[PDB]
Symmetry: C3
Subunit: 323 residues, 3 copies
Amino acid sequence: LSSSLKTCYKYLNQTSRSFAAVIQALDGEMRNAVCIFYLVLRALDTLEDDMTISVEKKVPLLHNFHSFLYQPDWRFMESKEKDRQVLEDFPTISLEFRNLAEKYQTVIADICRRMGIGMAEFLDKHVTSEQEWDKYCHYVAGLVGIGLSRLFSASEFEDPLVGEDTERANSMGLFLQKTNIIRDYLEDQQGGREFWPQEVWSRYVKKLGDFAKPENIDLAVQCLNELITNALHHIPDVITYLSRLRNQSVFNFCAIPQVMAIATLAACYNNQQVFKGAMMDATNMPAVKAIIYQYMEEIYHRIPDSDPSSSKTRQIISTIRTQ
Amino acid sequence: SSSLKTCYKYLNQTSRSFAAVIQALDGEMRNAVCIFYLVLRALDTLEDDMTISVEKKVPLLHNFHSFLYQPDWRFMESKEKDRQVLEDFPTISLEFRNLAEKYQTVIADICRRMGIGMAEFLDKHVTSEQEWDKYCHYVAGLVGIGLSRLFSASEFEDPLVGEDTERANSMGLFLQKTNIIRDYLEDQQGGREFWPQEVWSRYVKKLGDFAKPENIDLAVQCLNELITNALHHIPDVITYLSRLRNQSVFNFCAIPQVMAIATLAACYNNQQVFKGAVKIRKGQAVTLMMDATNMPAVKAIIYQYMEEIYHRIPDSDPSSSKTRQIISTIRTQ
Amino acid sequence: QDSLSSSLKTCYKYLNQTSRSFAAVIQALDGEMRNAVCIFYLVLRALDTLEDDMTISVEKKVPLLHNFHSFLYQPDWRFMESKEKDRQVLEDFPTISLEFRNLAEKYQTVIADICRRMGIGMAEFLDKHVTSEQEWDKYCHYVAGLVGIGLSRLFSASEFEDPLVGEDTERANSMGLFLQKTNIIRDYLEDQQGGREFWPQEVWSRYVKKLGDFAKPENIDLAVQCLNELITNALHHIPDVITYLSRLRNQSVFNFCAIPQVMAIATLAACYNNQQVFKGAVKIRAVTLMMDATNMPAVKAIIYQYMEEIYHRIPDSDPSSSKTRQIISTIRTQ
């Protein structure tokens, strides 16, 4: 019945229409800890995003963000972004953060500290290589999967092996992040944001923006297909990560977004609309396997032989189905 | 037995909605709940039948529980579609008397209490919201309480499930209120009134004025006020479901509750309650890959329907603050 | 590891080419069952493809069907003369049998035995149609019952299911009979177009002198009647199906066993009293939509709901109408 906790849940619903219901369904202490983690991550993301904040002002904000968690009066009033309310009323959020058990604070602060560095590192450059794509995805998403896993285990609802496996928790975040990046080409174009790796896109066109023109549609779809093929390499780790989970509320929280990203990839595959117009549930592991496999076959049947990634796309799906 | 076979046939004819989940119940609950539903159906059918004078109906409702004990009692004068359960009541009551004594206590107690309550309402419409709660207790709350006592008597669920009659009552009240709200137009065509008079008279002269195209704004305002009232039962519904441990009971209890919030979500601020038909279902993103058969999924499905309502609350609606407030409470608990 | 078996990868590619329906659920099986069932499925498909091929004469075919279980141990054996859609499993049979011989020997024994027995039975039916309902049961045992038996022995041998699962061959047999009878009922028309007859003669001859006649619009009423009789026959396996599923304890096996059965019951319900079975299409048709087939009480509810769908549709006019009601009533009984 605390006023500030009511407010935190109001903010969670405002900012995260995708995840709020599954966060609210989490058992015991995870529910509040994950709610607060999400809000603080959203605040950090909103600062990163805001192009009205100069790089020299933004670098210290990102570096020092983890420290603001411990400054009861800290807020930021100069943002012009959609989710600015979490920054403007950051004291309500940080107060509830400071009400969490210390074990959860430590994980959250650590992740904010590391994410802040990584976000600041990438402010003045675009992602070049695929290796750099992975690094940027680690900083903004892979670290979240690591942080979530450490929260699951700290709470004891999951076994300590969950939080220990940072490699696969990282792939969980890489998978969701690459999916959103793939899907959001047009949106990000409109916002002068570039997230597709340059070493990939420049084999097709001179400027990433070129994929938005009618005459480059064929090349665009080839590059789309290459990036999807890249994203699919995370699925074996996703399946191993999900298979270790023992708590139903955790399982639901982790599995549903992975399956939803898999559906998104399947719908995006070989789909020119990326550049223009656009009996099972997933709550037990064998069902989640089956659903992932059906989606892989939707991709597999659509692979064009002329596509320059075709062999690789068949190869990764063949790996997913077989092993 | 041949009589038990006939009871399952009747259950399937008269209970489109619960017949399959009842037949899936484990062990002794299956027969106990099958019989409970049939005698409730019989009682309901007597209550609904407008060719039975008040003079005759009052003793039938008060005395119905006792007919369970009387092997030859039947009723041959019903003009309702479900009348076969009354005409062949001896077959149903025989199986009632075949249940463990502990189940008979529960079923008869409920029938006794429900009959009294229904007889009390033969004479009057629902006035206050407190009166609304009382009516729904009689026709639905008591069913939840009865069912819960059956689960606990069967020992498939902990004693608490049967003991906490307030939570059980809330299960019935939530379903009943949703049904009453959903069914404005169908109960208008039928000539008896269920929306509470103390609420609707703050908007119009007679309840029938809501069907008239010029009163839509007030109609939807009242609709929204009543929905807001029903949302107050959700904490108890989550509490109740979260205490269940048996899969068959969980399925039986959880599915209608999810269907009920789904319905309220479709009705909220919706003109089609009054000048059309409300379509439920259809693609709420994150819950599309959840079935309602584990508690955390059910929590998520409920929370997501709450947000579907919350997103649609317009500032100018007189209840808008109260609707926000209860949803905020459900979210934070 | 990308240095592990390329031949197993090819097997899974074939499993997906040949099973548009089941591949995902087989791939979702725990542990040793995944590959055992994949390979079982592939060798069964190869056997079925030989049996199906009308360009192979009866005299040439019988020895292939009889010896197929031994070809499992002939590393270079393949069959190059098929023109059937799934002929790749025959042409690249060495890749499949290699992976078969890599299964633990306890699973090999089970699969070989079923292939042996299946071959004998298939060969028996090459020169006769199904006459009586007893013969219908026997044919269905040969091509499907035995599959349910073999799978159940794989489940028990893996230790993922109780030993009782593999021992109770009658319940396992009924699982196969239920699917196979449903498929035969649904495929009246496609089977007419390829000149092979599966509806039991002792039944259909009570309605027309020629099974082809059910495709004549003048006999549509007699067709639907005979149809209802066959569905009624198949419904009799449902108590055993429920008993079978109620013994399962491993989620992955449960999903694999229940989904096909639920799909079959849906099909029987969409077919019942439906003349579209003789004219065209047949596309599958509230509580059911809120639960999926992944726990036993939900499966019961789903089944019971399809039973009411049939029940309320029974025409008093129908000659099996009494019998349809009795079997559904029985299904409701336990």
